[PDB]
Structures are given as structure tokens and as C-alpha cells.
Amino acid sequence: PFTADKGKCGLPEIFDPPEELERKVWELARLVWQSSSVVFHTGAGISTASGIPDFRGPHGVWTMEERGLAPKFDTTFESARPTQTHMALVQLERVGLLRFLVSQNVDGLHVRSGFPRDKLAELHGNMFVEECAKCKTQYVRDTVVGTMGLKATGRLCTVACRGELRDTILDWEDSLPDRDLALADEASRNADLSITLGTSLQIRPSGNLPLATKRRGGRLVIVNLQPTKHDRHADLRIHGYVDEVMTRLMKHLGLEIPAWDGPRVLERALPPLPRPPTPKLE
Ligand SMILES: Nc1ncnc2c1ncn2[C@@H]1O[C@H](COP(=O)(O)OP(=O)(O)OC[C@H]2O[C@H](O)[C@H](O)[C@@H]2O)[C@@H](O)[C@H]1O
Numbered sequence: 001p002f003t004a005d006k007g008k009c010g011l012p013e014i015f016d017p018p019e020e021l022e023r024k025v026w027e028l029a030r031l032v033w034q035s036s037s038v039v040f041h042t043g044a045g046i047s048t049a050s051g052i053p054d055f056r057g058p059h060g061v062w063t064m065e066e067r068g069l070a071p072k073f074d075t076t077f078e079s080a081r082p083t084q085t086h087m088a089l090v091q092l093e094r095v096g097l098l099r100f101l102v103s104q105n106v107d108g109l110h111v112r113s114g115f116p117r118d119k120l121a122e123l124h125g126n127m128f129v130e131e132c133a134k135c136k137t138q139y140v141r142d143t144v145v146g147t148m149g150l151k152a153t154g155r156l157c158t159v160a161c162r163g164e165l166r167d168t169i170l171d172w173e174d175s176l177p178d179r180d181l182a183l184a185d186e187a188s189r190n191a192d193l194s195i196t197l198g199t200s201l202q203i204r205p206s207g208n209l210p211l212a213t214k215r216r217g218g219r220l221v222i223v224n225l226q227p228t229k230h231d232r233h234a235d236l237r238i239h240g241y242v243d244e245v246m247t248r249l250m251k252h253l254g255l256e257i258p259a260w261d262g263p264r265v266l267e268r269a270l271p272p273l274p275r276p277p278t279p280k281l282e
């Protein structure tokens, strides 16, 4: 916990040159078009362009700590806006091109983006979510729940119960929420395409779920500025900013990135919207 293993921190960044970057995003489009069941895996790299620092990037939390410096936030969690990548993931779900979303992120931005909570696994918890110890009812607050480590927040359950409410932030030694992990695992095993975005894949078992897509011959795409633990297992590795990658991809797919209305919570995925017809591939 003090000696908690933080993994490989501050590895050099890789940038694919523009011609290679454009060709690999075309190939990502081709894979997304061909796939029956697409699962996306997100880590802290998708929120860096909203001012929230990652863990192991050059100015990540743990990288900075190793060099006796502090991370820098350009936002509060409460004032953080969903990125282009966040909003692209909202649209890809609404048109049926995303089956499921697995996130290691605690920043609350997937939920706040409007992404349906029944297609999301929050493997490490949500800064804004408290849960009733008695009835298990979750509350999605407009401000961060002021405790970490699954502690009493001081609030009681209002279900029609008075149970103690606790944060959902795992400490190092805590095991993952059984529901979120079971659904992530089932989605990842059944996917024929898993796309990782802004995760170094160093944390077990979170970082290993994408590998489960490989069994029964599924494909694995890794989008990341640094090397990741499983780069060897990728069919496609794209070294670029996830916003540049996801906006080119959406343009290839003929989709617009929708407007963010401010913080909104969707419990259940709505019926699928229309999508463009598919290109002839080959
Ligand atoms: N805009 C960007 N575009 C692409 N890659 C990016 C960008 N910004 C950052 N990266 C990359 O994004 C990657 C982010 O990797 P890590 O910092 O390990 O975050 P995790 O989500 O995997 O951390 C998992 C858990 O570990 C913690 O202990 C907590 O418990 C976390 O929940 C880096 O390789 C960056 O190069």
C-alpha cells in the first residue's frame, strides 16, 4: 500500500507517423465493420485531455511520485468534461457498434457522459457513486463521495432501509466488484473485437480481460501512447492520442460525435439508433 507495486512508470511515448496512423485507423474501421461483438476497455489515458492526469504516463501520478514531484490536475472531478473519446463511445453504443464498456477509471466521466450504466463495468469504482451496505442500492451523486477504500460516507440509505452508504473506491488489497467483473469477463470472452484505449494494461485482472477476446480467435486492438503489458498479443497497436484516433475512426464510420448536455445519468441503454450502411470489404 505504501510499498504497493505501482508497476512500470514513465516509459517513453511512441508516435506512429501520420501516414501509418491514417492507415491503422482505416484498419480499425475495417475491424469494427467486420465484428459481431465489440468491447472497449478504457483507462486513465482517455481523461488526460480533460485535465485529469494518468498514473504511469510521463507526468502520471506514480511517475511524478517516483521523482518526488506531484501530479497536476487542470480540473476538479466535478468540473471535468467528457472528452471527444468519451462522447464517441456514447455514440458507438447508441448505434449498436459497441456491445460493452469496461473501465478501470474512477473519474466518473463515462456515467456523467450519459453512457448507459447497464453496458458499463466500473472495475475500480466511481468517485461519485456510494452503495448501501444493506440493500446494495447505488446512488450517483453530483459531487465526489468524500471517502476512498469502501468506508462509511456518513449518509444513510433512503430506499422505501437506513443502511450505511459507503464509497466504491477499491484500495490496493480490495477484490473487484463481483457483478462488474463477471459482466466484463463475459463481455470480453464473447467479444470478437476488444479495443483498449489509454490503458497500460499493468493491473490484474483488469488489464487481462482484453486477452480473453483472443480465445476462439477474437481480435485485439491496443491504442496507447506508451508500450503496454500485452502489446505482443495485439493484432493492431496504434500509437497516437485517443481523441485523434477516435475522431478519425468516427469520420470513417460516418458518425458524428454528439454534444454533451452536462452531467446526466442513464441507468438503461435505449433502443438502438440507425447507422450508416457498411462498406464492401475485399
Ligand atoms: N491522450 C492520450 N492518448 C493515448 N494514450 C494516452 C493518452 N494519455 C495517456 N495515455 C496513455 O494511457 C496509459 C494510461 O496508463 P496508466 O497511467 O497505467 O492508467 P490505467 O488506467 O491503465 O491504470 C490502471 C489503474 O492503475 C492505477 O493504480 C489505478 O488503480 C487505475 O485504475 C499510459 O500508458 C499513457 O501512455
Ligand SMILES: O=c1c(O[C@@H]2O[C@H](CO)[C@@H](O)[C@H](O)[C@H]2O)c(-c2ccc(O)c(O)c2)oc2cc(O)cc(O)c12
Residues within 6 Å of the ligand: 044, 047, 052, 053, 054, 055, 061, 105, 106, 107, 124, 148, 169, 170
Ligand atoms: O483519490 C484520488 C484519485 O483517485 C485515485 O483512485 C485510485 C484507485 O484506482 C487510487 O489508486 C489512487 O490512489 C487515487 O489517486 C486520483 C486520481 C488520479 C488520476 C486519475 O486518472 C484518476 O482517475 C484519479 O487522484 C487523487 C489525488 C489526490 O491528491 C487525492 C486523491 O484522493 C486522489
Ligand SMILES: [Zn+2]
Residues within 6 Å of the ligand: 132, 133, 134, 135, 136, 137, 157, 158, 159, 161, 162, 163
Ligand atoms: Zn439500502
